[PDB]
């Protein structure tokens, strides 16, 4: 079981939805990543980034799913030039494309939580993106912390465990109309 979370694209009437197994880490989402093949990419890419996005989409189409999701391969990607809006606090999150996100799985878009997801962490370290701890237990600048722990830096989720935080965040999202549990 997981959840869908919907993000508005800043400065537009566009939105996209991600699939996440950990809606409770929403306050640690410091960027979002679309599959290079995602349907929204071309419409939100800025003119300055357009050529780099086109070049990267071509590169990504020449790699299989297995090579793209391989943990040992160097992370690659490019900024679209656009920002998503985090629904819980209104903060802007840069929208990247990266081939470790697969078009066919879930929605083809993720919220990136580099502190607590190994692939997001590798991407953030490769591209100097912020890393924000929301589950205590590790030292997230040195190593992704991929285990359970009490929530921090998470407003009304602070002090809760995974099961409680997930229930609370999903309730908040369903109530704003920008999230729901998904299986
Ligand atoms: C079921 C549980 O609670 C088990 S405790 C657990 C502990 C750590 C992690 C960790 O890693 C993690 C941390 C945070 C986030 C996650 C993960 B996220 C986004 C937020 O949840 C990911 C989601 O990003 C990513 N993802 C979705 N769509 C695609 C796609 N199209 N391409 C490539 N990646 C994609 O992967 C799904 C689930 O993956 P599953 O369905 O294989 O389980 C997790 C659990």
Short mmCIF file of C-alpha atoms and ligand atoms in Angstrom, two decimals:
data_model
loop_
_atom_site.label_atom_id
_atom_site.label_comp_id
_atom_site.label_asym_id
_atom_site.label_seq_id
_atom_site.Cartn_x
_atom_site.Cartn_y
_atom_site.Cartn_z
CA UNK A 1 0.00 0.00 0.00
CA UNK A 2 1.09 3.55 -0.77
CA UNK A 3 -0.28 6.93 -1.71
CA UNK A 4 -0.64 9.37 -4.58
CA UNK A 5 0.38 12.98 -3.99
CA UNK A 6 -0.45 15.79 -6.39
CA UNK A 7 1.86 18.77 -6.95
CA UNK A 8 1.09 22.01 -8.75
CA UNK A 9 3.71 23.37 -11.16
CA UNK A 10 4.65 26.90 -10.12
CA UNK A 11 3.61 29.66 -12.50
CA UNK A 12 1.25 27.43 -14.51
CA UNK A 13 -2.12 25.70 -14.44
CA UNK A 14 -0.38 22.30 -14.59
CA UNK A 15 -0.12 19.54 -11.98
CA UNK A 16 1.37 16.08 -11.71
CA UNK A 17 0.85 13.14 -9.39
CA UNK A 18 3.54 10.93 -7.85
CA UNK A 19 3.30 7.46 -6.34
CA UNK A 20 5.00 7.10 -2.99
CA UNK A 21 5.37 4.33 -0.45
CA UNK A 22 6.25 6.97 2.21
CA UNK A 23 3.85 9.94 2.16
CA UNK A 24 5.08 10.52 5.73
CA UNK A 25 8.39 11.85 4.34
CA UNK A 26 6.71 14.68 2.41
CA UNK A 27 8.43 17.37 4.48
CA UNK A 28 11.79 15.95 3.37
CA UNK A 29 10.98 16.06 -0.35
CA UNK A 30 13.51 18.58 -1.64
CA UNK A 31 12.92 18.02 -5.37
CA UNK A 32 10.69 16.05 -7.72
CA UNK A 33 11.76 13.80 -10.61
CA UNK A 34 9.78 12.94 -13.75
CA UNK A 35 10.62 10.08 -16.07
CA UNK A 36 12.18 11.65 -19.18
CA UNK A 37 9.20 10.18 -21.09
CA UNK A 38 6.60 11.72 -18.74
CA UNK A 39 3.79 13.47 -20.60
CA UNK A 40 4.22 16.80 -18.78
CA UNK A 41 7.94 17.35 -19.51
CA UNK A 42 7.72 19.27 -22.79
CA UNK A 43 4.97 21.61 -21.59
CA UNK A 44 6.81 22.78 -18.43
CA UNK A 45 10.41 22.80 -19.68
CA UNK A 46 11.80 26.34 -19.90
CA UNK A 47 13.29 27.71 -23.11
CA UNK A 48 16.73 27.88 -21.46
CA UNK A 49 16.57 24.16 -20.56
CA UNK A 50 14.76 22.94 -23.68
CA UNK A 51 17.81 21.73 -25.61
CA UNK A 52 19.38 19.97 -22.62
CA UNK A 53 16.06 18.28 -21.88
CA UNK A 54 15.76 17.13 -25.51
CA UNK A 55 19.32 15.78 -25.47
CA UNK A 56 18.73 13.92 -22.21
CA UNK A 57 15.43 12.42 -23.38
CA UNK A 58 17.27 11.02 -26.39
CA UNK A 59 20.04 9.54 -24.20
CA UNK A 60 17.48 7.99 -21.84
CA UNK A 61 15.57 6.28 -24.66
CA UNK A 62 18.75 4.34 -25.52
CA UNK A 63 18.95 2.69 -22.07
CA UNK A 64 16.92 -0.28 -20.84
CA UNK A 65 14.91 -0.25 -17.62
CA UNK A 66 17.48 -2.58 -16.02
CA UNK A 67 20.41 -0.28 -16.78
CA UNK A 68 18.39 2.78 -15.71
CA UNK A 69 17.43 1.45 -12.27
CA UNK A 70 20.82 -0.14 -11.58
CA UNK A 71 22.03 1.11 -8.16
CA UNK A 72 25.68 0.95 -9.32
CA UNK A 73 25.29 3.28 -12.33
CA UNK A 74 26.13 6.97 -12.02
CA UNK A 75 22.98 9.08 -11.70
CA UNK A 76 22.25 11.47 -14.55
CA UNK A 77 19.59 14.05 -15.21
CA UNK A 78 18.75 17.63 -16.06
CA UNK A 79 16.63 20.38 -14.54
CA UNK A 80 13.46 21.10 -16.52
CA UNK A 81 13.54 24.77 -15.53
CA UNK A 82 10.31 24.39 -13.54
CA UNK A 83 9.32 24.09 -9.87
CA UNK A 84 6.67 22.04 -8.08
CA UNK A 85 4.80 23.26 -5.00
CA UNK A 86 4.86 21.09 -1.88
CA UNK A 87 1.21 20.94 -0.71
CA UNK A 88 2.05 20.81 3.03
CA UNK A 89 4.03 24.05 3.22
CA UNK A 90 3.93 25.74 -0.19
CA UNK A 91 7.70 25.43 -0.73
CA UNK A 92 9.11 25.23 -4.27
CA UNK A 93 10.82 21.98 -5.32
CA UNK A 94 12.84 21.95 -8.58
CA UNK A 95 11.46 19.51 -11.17
CA UNK A 96 14.18 17.32 -12.70
CA UNK A 97 14.07 14.52 -15.23
CA UNK A 98 16.32 11.54 -14.57
CA UNK A 99 16.36 8.12 -16.16
CA UNK A 100 16.30 6.23 -12.85
CA UNK A 101 12.59 7.14 -12.81
CA UNK A 102 10.64 4.77 -15.07
CA UNK A 103 7.71 5.94 -17.17
CA UNK A 104 5.80 2.66 -16.82
CA UNK A 105 5.86 2.33 -13.01
CA UNK A 106 3.38 4.19 -10.84
CA UNK A 107 2.73 7.59 -12.37
CA UNK A 108 6.20 7.93 -13.86
CA UNK A 109 6.94 10.70 -11.31
CA UNK A 110 8.36 10.68 -7.78
CA UNK A 111 8.89 13.03 -4.91
CA UNK A 112 12.59 12.77 -4.13
CA UNK A 113 13.48 12.27 -0.46
CA UNK A 114 17.28 12.04 -0.63
CA UNK A 115 17.69 11.65 3.16
CA UNK A 116 15.74 8.38 3.20
CA UNK A 117 15.90 6.84 -0.32
CA UNK A 118 19.16 5.47 -1.71
CA UNK A 119 18.57 6.45 -5.33
CA UNK A 120 17.32 9.93 -4.43
CA UNK A 121 20.36 10.32 -2.17
CA UNK A 122 22.82 9.38 -4.93
CA UNK A 123 21.07 11.81 -7.26
CA UNK A 124 21.18 14.64 -4.71
CA UNK A 125 24.88 14.06 -4.01
CA UNK A 126 25.60 14.00 -7.75
CA UNK A 127 23.78 17.30 -8.39
CA UNK A 128 24.43 19.15 -5.07
CA UNK A 129 20.75 19.18 -4.10
CA UNK A 130 19.56 19.71 -0.51
CA UNK A 131 19.16 16.73 1.82
CA UNK A 132 16.65 17.08 4.69
CA UNK A 133 16.24 14.59 7.54
CA UNK A 134 12.65 13.82 8.56
CA UNK A 135 13.24 10.43 10.26
CA UNK A 136 15.90 10.33 12.96
CA UNK A 137 18.33 7.47 13.34
CA UNK A 138 21.11 8.32 10.91
CA UNK A 139 23.40 11.02 9.52
CA UNK A 140 21.72 11.71 6.22
CA UNK A 141 24.45 13.87 4.68
CA UNK A 142 26.84 10.90 4.88
CA UNK A 143 24.44 8.03 4.14
CA UNK A 144 20.78 7.75 3.23
CA UNK A 145 18.84 6.56 6.29
CA UNK A 146 16.46 3.94 4.89
CA UNK A 147 14.90 2.71 8.16
CA UNK A 148 12.11 3.71 10.51
CA UNK A 149 12.41 6.30 13.26
CA UNK A 150 10.61 9.18 14.90
CA UNK A 151 9.67 12.03 12.56
CA UNK A 152 11.50 15.36 12.81
CA UNK A 153 11.34 18.58 10.83
CA UNK A 154 7.83 17.48 9.86
CA UNK A 155 5.48 19.96 11.57
CA UNK A 156 2.42 18.06 12.82
CA UNK A 157 4.06 14.68 12.13
CA UNK A 158 6.87 15.22 14.67
CA UNK A 159 7.28 12.45 17.21
CA UNK A 160 5.13 9.94 15.33
CA UNK A 161 6.20 6.55 14.00
CA UNK A 162 5.67 5.40 10.41
CA UNK A 163 2.17 3.99 10.79
CA UNK A 164 0.86 7.02 12.68
CA UNK A 165 2.55 9.60 10.46
CA UNK A 166 1.23 7.90 7.31
CA UNK A 167 -2.34 7.95 8.63
CA UNK A 168 -2.04 11.59 9.65
CA UNK A 169 -0.44 12.86 6.42
CA UNK A 170 -2.88 10.94 4.22
CA UNK A 171 -5.80 12.40 6.19
CA UNK A 172 -4.38 15.90 5.70
CA UNK A 173 -3.81 15.36 1.97
CA UNK A 174 -7.23 13.79 1.32
CA UNK A 175 -8.75 16.75 3.08
CA UNK A 176 -6.98 19.28 0.87
CA UNK A 177 -7.84 17.16 -2.17
CA UNK A 178 -4.22 16.53 -3.20
CA UNK A 179 -3.55 13.01 -1.93
CA UNK A 180 -5.06 9.58 -1.41
CA UNK A 181 -3.92 6.11 -0.43
CA UNK A 182 -3.16 3.90 -3.42
CA UNK A 183 -2.61 0.17 -3.90
C1 LIG B 1 6.35 -0.46 2.01
C2 LIG B 1 7.13 0.28 3.11
O1 LIG B 1 6.65 1.26 3.61
C3 LIG B 1 8.52 -0.30 3.53
S1 LIG B 1 9.63 0.78 4.53
C4 LIG B 1 10.59 1.88 3.42
C5 LIG B 1 11.76 2.50 3.84
C6 LIG B 1 12.46 3.34 2.96
C7 LIG B 1 11.97 3.55 1.66
C8 LIG B 1 12.70 4.47 0.67
O2 LIG B 1 13.27 3.77 -0.42
C9 LIG B 1 11.74 5.57 0.13
C10 LIG B 1 11.72 6.71 0.96
C11 LIG B 1 10.94 7.80 0.61
C12 LIG B 1 10.17 7.75 -0.58
C13 LIG B 1 10.10 6.61 -1.41
C14 LIG B 1 10.97 5.52 -1.07
B1 LIG B 1 9.19 7.04 -2.67
C15 LIG B 1 9.04 8.56 -2.56
C16 LIG B 1 9.24 8.87 -1.11
O3 LIG B 1 8.55 5.76 -2.50
C17 LIG B 1 9.05 5.13 -3.73
C18 LIG B 1 8.98 5.97 -4.57
O4 LIG B 1 9.57 7.16 -3.84
C19 LIG B 1 9.73 5.23 -5.85
N1 LIG B 1 9.09 5.28 -7.21
C20 LIG B 1 7.78 5.46 -7.44
N2 LIG B 1 7.55 5.45 -8.74
C21 LIG B 1 8.75 5.27 -9.39
C22 LIG B 1 9.12 5.19 -10.78
N3 LIG B 1 8.11 5.32 -11.81
N4 LIG B 1 10.40 5.01 -11.09
C23 LIG B 1 11.33 4.90 -10.12
N5 LIG B 1 11.02 4.96 -8.82
C24 LIG B 1 9.72 5.15 -8.43
O5 LIG B 1 9.66 3.98 -5.50
C25 LIG B 1 8.45 3.99 -4.63
C26 LIG B 1 8.12 2.68 -3.92
O6 LIG B 1 8.77 1.67 -4.61
P1 LIG B 1 8.11 0.15 -4.53
O7 LIG B 1 6.57 0.19 -5.12
O8 LIG B 1 9.06 -0.84 -5.44
O9 LIG B 1 8.08 -0.28 -2.94
C27 LIG B 1 10.80 2.95 1.25
C28 LIG B 1 10.10 2.11 2.12
#
